[PDB]
Amino acid sequence: WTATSGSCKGRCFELQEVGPPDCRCDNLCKSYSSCCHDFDELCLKTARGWECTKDRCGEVRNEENACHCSEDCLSRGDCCTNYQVVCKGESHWVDDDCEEIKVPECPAGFVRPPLIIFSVDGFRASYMKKGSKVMPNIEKLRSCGTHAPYMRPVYPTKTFPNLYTLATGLYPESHGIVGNSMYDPVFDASFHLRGREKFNHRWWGGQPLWITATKQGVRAGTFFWSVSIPHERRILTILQWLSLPDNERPSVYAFYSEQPDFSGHKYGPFGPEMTNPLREIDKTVGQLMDGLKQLRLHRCVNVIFVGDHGMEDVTCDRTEFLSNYLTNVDDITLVPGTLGRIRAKSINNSKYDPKTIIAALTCKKPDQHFKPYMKQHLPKRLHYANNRRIEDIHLLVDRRWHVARKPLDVYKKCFFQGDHGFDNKVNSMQTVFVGYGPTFKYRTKVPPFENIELYNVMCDLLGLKPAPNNGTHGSLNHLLRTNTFRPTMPDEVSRPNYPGIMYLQSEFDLGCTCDDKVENKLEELNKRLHTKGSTKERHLLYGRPAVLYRTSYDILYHTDFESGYSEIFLMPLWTSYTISKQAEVSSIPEHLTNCVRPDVRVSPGFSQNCLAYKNDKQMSYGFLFPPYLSSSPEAKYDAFLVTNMVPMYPAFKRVWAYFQRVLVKKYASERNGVNVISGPIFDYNYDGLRDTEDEIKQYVEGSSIPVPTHYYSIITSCLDFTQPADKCDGPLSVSSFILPHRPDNDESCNSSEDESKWVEELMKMHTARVRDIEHLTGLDFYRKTSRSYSEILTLKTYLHTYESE
Numbered sequence: 001w002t003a004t005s006g007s008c009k010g011r012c013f014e015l016q017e018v019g020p021p022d023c024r025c026d027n028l029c030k031s032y033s034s035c036c037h038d039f040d041e042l043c044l045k046t047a048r049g050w051e052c053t054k055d056r057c058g059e060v061r062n063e064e065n066a067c068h069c070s071e072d073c074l075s076r077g078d079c080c081t082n083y084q085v086v087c088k089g090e091s092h093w094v095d096d097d098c099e100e101i102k103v104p105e106c107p108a109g110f111v112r113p114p115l116i117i118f119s120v121d122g123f124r125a126s127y128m129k130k131g132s133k134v135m136p137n138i139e140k141l142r143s144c145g146t147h148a149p150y151m152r153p154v155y156p157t158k159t160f161p162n163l164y165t166l167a168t169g170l171y172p173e174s175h176g177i178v179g180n181s182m183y184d185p186v187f188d189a190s191f192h193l194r195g196r197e198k199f200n201h202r203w204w205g206g207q208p209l210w211i212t213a214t215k216q217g218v219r220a221g222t223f224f225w226s227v228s229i230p231h232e233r234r235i236l237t238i239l240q241w242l243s244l245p246d247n248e249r250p251s252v253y254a255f256y257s258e259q260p261d262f263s264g265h266k267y268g269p270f271g272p273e274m275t276n277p278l279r280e281i282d283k284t285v286g287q288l289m290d291g292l293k294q295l296r297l298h299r300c301v302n303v304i305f306v307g308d309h310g311m312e313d314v315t316c317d318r319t320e321f322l323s324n325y326l327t328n329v330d331d332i333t334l335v336p337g338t339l340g341r342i343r344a345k346s347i348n349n350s351k352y353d354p355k356t357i358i359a360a361l362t363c364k365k366p367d368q369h370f371k372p373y374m375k376q377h378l379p380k381r382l383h384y385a386n387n388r389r390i391e392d393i394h395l396l397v398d399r400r401w402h403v404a405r406k407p408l409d410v411y412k413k414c415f416f417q418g419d420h421g422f423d424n425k426v427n428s429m430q431t432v433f434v435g436y437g438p439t440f441k442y443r444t445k446v447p448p449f450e451n452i453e454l455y456n457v458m459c460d461l462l463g464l465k466p467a468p469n470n471g472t473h474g475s476l477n478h479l480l481r482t483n484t485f486r487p488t489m490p491d492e493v494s495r496p497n498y499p500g501i502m503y504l505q506s507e508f509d510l511g512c513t514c515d516d517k518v519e520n521k522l523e524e525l526n527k528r529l530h531t532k533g534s535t536k537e538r539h540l541l542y543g544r545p546a547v548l549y550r551t552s553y554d555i556l557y558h559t560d561f562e563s564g565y566s567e568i569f570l571m572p573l574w575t576s577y578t579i580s581k582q583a584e585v586s587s588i589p590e591h592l593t594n595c596v597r598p599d600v601r602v603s604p605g606f607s608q609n610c611l612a613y614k615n616d617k618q619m620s621y622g623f624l625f626p627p628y629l630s631s632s633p634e635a636k637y638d639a640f641l642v643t644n645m646v647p648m649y650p651a652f653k654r655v656w657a658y659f660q661r662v663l664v665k666k667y668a669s670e671r672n673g674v675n676v677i678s679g680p681i682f683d684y685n686y687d688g689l690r691d692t693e694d695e696i697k698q699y700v701e702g703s704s705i706p707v708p709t710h711y712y713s714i715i716t717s718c719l720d721f722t723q724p725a726d727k728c729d730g731p732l733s734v735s736s737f738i739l740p741h742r743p744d745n746d747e748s749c750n751s752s753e754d755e756s757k758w759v760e761e762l763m764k765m766h767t768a769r770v771r772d773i774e775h776l777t778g779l780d781f782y783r784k785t786s787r788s789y790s791e792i793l794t795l796k797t798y799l800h801t802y803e804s805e
């Protein structure tokens with residue numbers, strides 16, 4: 001019930017929300033059907049339009065007008081945005097030459113530069129170049145302020161997931177808004193774009209910027225606008241709030257625009273009908289900037305121009321139907337569109353089986369335009385699994401396509417020419433970032449970054465302390481003139497042991513053999529110094545990684561490679577080696593094919609054994625440092641040490657062997673040498689965090705050798721590839737992957753072909769940030785470089801996407 005009989009007289013767009021059943025006048029009252037009777041009349045005036053004309057100049061104040069051209073309007077803070085241009089011979093903001101803003105130039109009373117977030121739905125990254133002729137305001141913001149070629153949204157590339165990520169710094173799996181449409185098994189409730197349930201506070205986790213600000217004593221304008229409030233009214237409202245007395249005036253504001261997304265759904269991302277929407281957005285920007293300039297706030301305010309996702313071409317004829325794959329199509333519910341989410345229609349059906357559903361959706365048609373996944377098998381870079389609201393079965397849909405249940409769902413619902421929601425590495429999904437103001441840099445391009453990073457910066461811009469989030473704080477310092485947050489390296493928790501020769505061959509009963517029984521003063525001093533660390537400067541280029549948890553491990557040195565060996569997991573946590581441009585691939589000689597050697601530095605009780613692998617019919621084994629790249633026939637023996645061994649499914653061995661034998665050498669040639677750090681990952685509870693011992697769901701049969709869920713590699717070289725990896729003087733260049741450790745290659749539909757036809761494709765899909773690898777291993781890389789910590793932070797958050805230009 002709402003008792004809509006109160007009034008909005010002097011309450012228009014009140015900042016505090018009044019409690020039911022009293023009537024409301026907040027910018028969200030229309031969406032709850034709870035505005036006072038006189039809201040439209042008093043608060044949504046439209047009389048005479050949005051612009052001053054020559055004849056309105058110096059007029060008599062008529063309170064009915066939407067905005068004013070009277071003499072007293074500047075004091076009232078309620079002029080039309082063009083008042084000074086029309087009536088005082090001033091010029092539009094866009095027509096002024098841009099001058100650097102070395103310091104905030106604010107009116108007296110301002111405790112800090114305010115922040116305006118200008119959000120534009122569906123603003124594809126390419127619109128910046130492709131629409132530059134029709135967006136002079138936006139283009140001035142971009143070229144005078146700080147900008148990125150594009151900003152990467154989060155998956156799923158939808159509105160609410162992305163706007164709430166901006167607001168919180170969190171992955172959707174952590175903030176809860178994991179789609180535009182959701183079911184929560186625990187609440188037994190559903191979340192839709194239409195309706196009431198989307199307003200209930202239990203869906204929304206984390207701590208959004210407006211709450212972060214309020215708790216720390218910074219006042220916030222209300223971020224949301226009811227859909228029927230015209231854009232011009234939103235701008236005038238923000239401008240009005242900026243005129244308030246120092247004690248009531250907010251420090252952070254938000255504007256949202258439904259365009260260009262609304263039009264892009266109808267016309268496609270580049271429909272000729274798209275030029276007008278891009279013009280209107282620019283005009284709106286102009287109005288804001290002209291309004292700020294009237295109030296002397298245009299060299300005081302920080303403006304963030306930001307999109308939620310891009311837009312792709314999608315039509316009805318490009319829809320795949322699950323009814324062409326499944327018989328039991330009515331025992332299932334599907335969340336449809338640019339992503340698939342399948343669950344049972346009824347929990348009382350005990351015959352429904354996810355296993356056979358996946359199988360039935362796997363590589364069934366030669367051109368298939370979606371791929372089924374158990375959520376835990378989705379690429380780790382998507383961070384899309386650890387939430388009860390994400391269904392166990394997910395369909396990653398090809399760019400340009402749709403997935404629906406039955407064909408009736410499509411025609412009983414062609415309407416659209418555009419859509420979005422695909423994998424967030426897809427070019428057409430990229431969106432924009434521009435920052436303009438005294439705290440941002442002047443005329444500066446920065447590299448592409450991810451939207452999870454903005455929350456921290458917005459907090460820096462406001463003098464706030466961020467709530468714990470998934471940004472990496474300091475990784476976007478290069479955006480800022482000042483107010484930079486100065487981060488320290490996390491402290492190492494566990495210090496390594498450095499074991500020497502402590503055990504005799506005969507103490508090992510591992511069930512391993514090696515043909516290593518063939519027999520000098522010059523060359524024996526040489527191997528000693530290698531096992532103490534004479535080549536360590538060569539293979540450990542950026543320091544040893546720090547172990548940020550409590551554990552027991554050993555550093556092991558060798559001619560060709562260095563490792564941190566875990567006595568708890570019985571394998572290395574990491575192995576580090578450098579392959580230079582000139583290095584040569586060799587084979588595994590016949591006599592050493594099944595050779596596994598005891599490591600005399602590590603006790604039998606902390607080693608694996610061959611018998612476990614013999615007795616396990618499913619599991620085989622592999623090596624972290626590849627024997628193929630041994631520097632000499634003698635060094636090659638080191639690669640067969642039981643401490644270099646890790647568990648591998650024969651299906652995964654095909655992947656790993658091709659990566660080690662072919663791809664490593666390929667990258668060394670292309671990149672002028674590479675440093676490689678490789679290791680196992682354990683994430684049985686799919687939270688993106690390193691599992692402790694008691695979380696491991698699978699061991700090698702009849703042993704305590706734990707099975708990794710993934711294998712990573714970090715490949716580093718010099719950004720200036722004229723300098724070889726091992727002698728680099730400048731910035732570094734990195735790419736990484738987190739390969740799922742799977743007993744079959746069902747994910748790659750071409751896996752019965754030669755490895756050169758599918759392997760590198762799989763690796764690309766599983767590309768990763770070093771930071772992803774850090775969360776999953778509890779290690780901290782790049783501890784000793786000649787580079788600044790902020791710059792390293794940026795490097796760690798880099799993602800190599802393999803998307804073209």
Ligand SMILES: *[C@@H]1O[C@H](CO)[C@@H](O[C@@H]2O[C@H](CO)[C@@H](O[C@@H]3O[C@H](CO[C@H]4O[C@H](CO)[C@@H](O)[C@H](O[C@H]5O[C@H](CO)[C@@H](O)[C@H](O)[C@@H]5O[C@H]5O[C@H](CO)[C@@H](O)[C@H](O)[C@@H]5O)[C@@H]4O)[C@@H](O)[C@H](O[C@H]4O[C@H](CO)[C@@H](O)[C@H](O)[C@@H]4O[C@H]4O[C@H](CO)[C@@H](O)[C@H](O)[C@@H]4O)[C@@H]3O)[C@H](O)[C@H]2NC(C)=O)[C@H](O)[C@H]1NC(C)=O
Pocket residue numbers: 170171173174175176202203204205206383386387388468469470687688689775
């Ligand atoms: C990205 O960044 C985020 C933010 O930093 C990272 O997530 C954090 O990770 C922490 C570790 O996983 C986690 O800490 C836990 O806190 C638990 C209490 O949680 C409440 O309080 C927080 C803080 O205010 C709040 O944010 C939470 O809100 C969640 O839950 C509701 C729904 O229930 C949602 O509204 C909201 O969206 C959010 O959901 C998300 O997070 C939770 C994780 O808590 C997930 O379950 C959801 O799927 C969703 O993703 C909560 O209101 C606390 O209970 C935990 O403590 C247990 O474990 C410790 C280990 O130290 C142990 O000592 C304790 O015994 C305890 O175990 C007991 O309970 C167990 C389970 O019932 C049981 O098995 C045991 O036997 C014990 O009885 C834990 O310390 C922190 O909450 C989240 N924060 C957020 C916002 O998600 C994230 O890791 C980052 N991602 C990456 C990849 O780096």
Ligand SMILES: CCCOc1ncc(-c2ccc(C(=O)NC)cc2[N+](=O)[O-])cc1C
Pocket residue numbers: 117119159160163164166167223224225226227254256258
């Ligand atoms: C810094 C990000 C601010 O966070 C947000 N900003 C705007 C919205 C929002 C979403 C949809 C619509 C709409 O009209 N859809 C038809 C309107 C608004 N709105 O006006 O607020 C949501 C959020 C979380």
Ligand SMILES: [Ca+2]
Pocket residue numbers: 121122158159160261308309
């Ligand atoms: Ca959107």
Ligand SMILES: [Ca+2]
Pocket residue numbers: 682683684685686687688689690691
């Ligand atoms: Ca985990």
Ligand SMILES: [Cl-]
Pocket residue numbers: 156158178179180181335
């Ligand atoms: Cl969705």
Ligand SMILES: [K+]
Pocket residue numbers: 613614615616617618619620
């Ligand atoms: K085996």
Ligand code: NA
Pocket residue numbers: 745746747748749750751752
């Ligand atoms: Na296959």
Ligand SMILES: [Zn+2]
Pocket residue numbers: 122261262265420
């Ligand atoms: Zn949309």
